[PDB]
């Protein structure tokens, strides 16, 4: 509103359309994509490793697990969850409670739930890479 910028490059209105599709002329998506992780820009916490990114199929924003934490960590994470099988067919969906970010979901492909695909949408999420000269996480300094 009151603009041309946000109309030519929408954000909250764009990612909500990308919540179902791939696109050609991918540009910045036509090169390599490194290892790393993803975190909120709404709360505090890093939550998903790019290590589980569905590469060598589509490279698209999916995560073959929500990978970094286990068992003990299901209270620590500040993430929550909600299942739905009520249309006669089972779905699984997940939220961060810290940010209230309801952005991660996992759906079957037709066979057993062993074939599932876990899609996550970046509408309030940022990322940090694995490799240095863009990773620089701890201090490097002296006396």
Question: Any idea which residues carry the catalytic annotation?
Answer: 119
Shorter beta-carbon distance to Zn ion: residue 39 or 52: 39
Termini Cα distance of the chain? 51
Residue 43 marked ligand-binding: yes
Q: What is the smallest separation between the CB atom of 41 and Zn ion, expressed in angstroms?
A: 9
**What is the dihedral sign for C-alpha 111, 112, 115, 121?**
positive
User: Which segments within 2-103 are labelled E, that is strand?
Assistant: 36-40, 46-49, 79-84, 91-96
User: Does residue number 95 form part of the binding site for Zn ion (CB under 5 A)?
Assistant: no
Q: What is the smallest separation between the CB atom of 42 and Zn ion, expressed in angstroms?
A: 6
Residue 40 marked ligand-binding: yes
Residues that bind Zn ion (CB under 5 A): 40, 43, 45, 96, 98-99
């Amino acid at each position: 509103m009151a603009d041309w910028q946000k109309k030519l490059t929408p954000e909250q209105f764009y990612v909500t359309r990308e919540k179902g599709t791939e696109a050609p002329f991918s540009g910045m998506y036509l090169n390599n994509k490194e290892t790393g992780m993803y975190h909120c820009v709404c709360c505090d916490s890093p939550l998903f490793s790019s290590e589980k990114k569905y590469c060598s199929g589509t490279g698209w924003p999916s995560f073959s697990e929500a990978y970094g934490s286990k068992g003990s960590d299901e209270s620590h994470t500040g993430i929550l969850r909600r299942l739905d099988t009520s249309l006669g067919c089972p779905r699984m969906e997940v939220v961060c409670k810290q940010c209230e970010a309801h952005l991660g979901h996992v759906f079957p492909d037709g066979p057993k739930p062993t074939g599932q695909r876990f899609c996550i949408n970046s509408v309030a999420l940022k990322f940090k890479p694995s490799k240095p000269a863009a990773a620089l996480e701890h201090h490097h300094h002296h006396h």
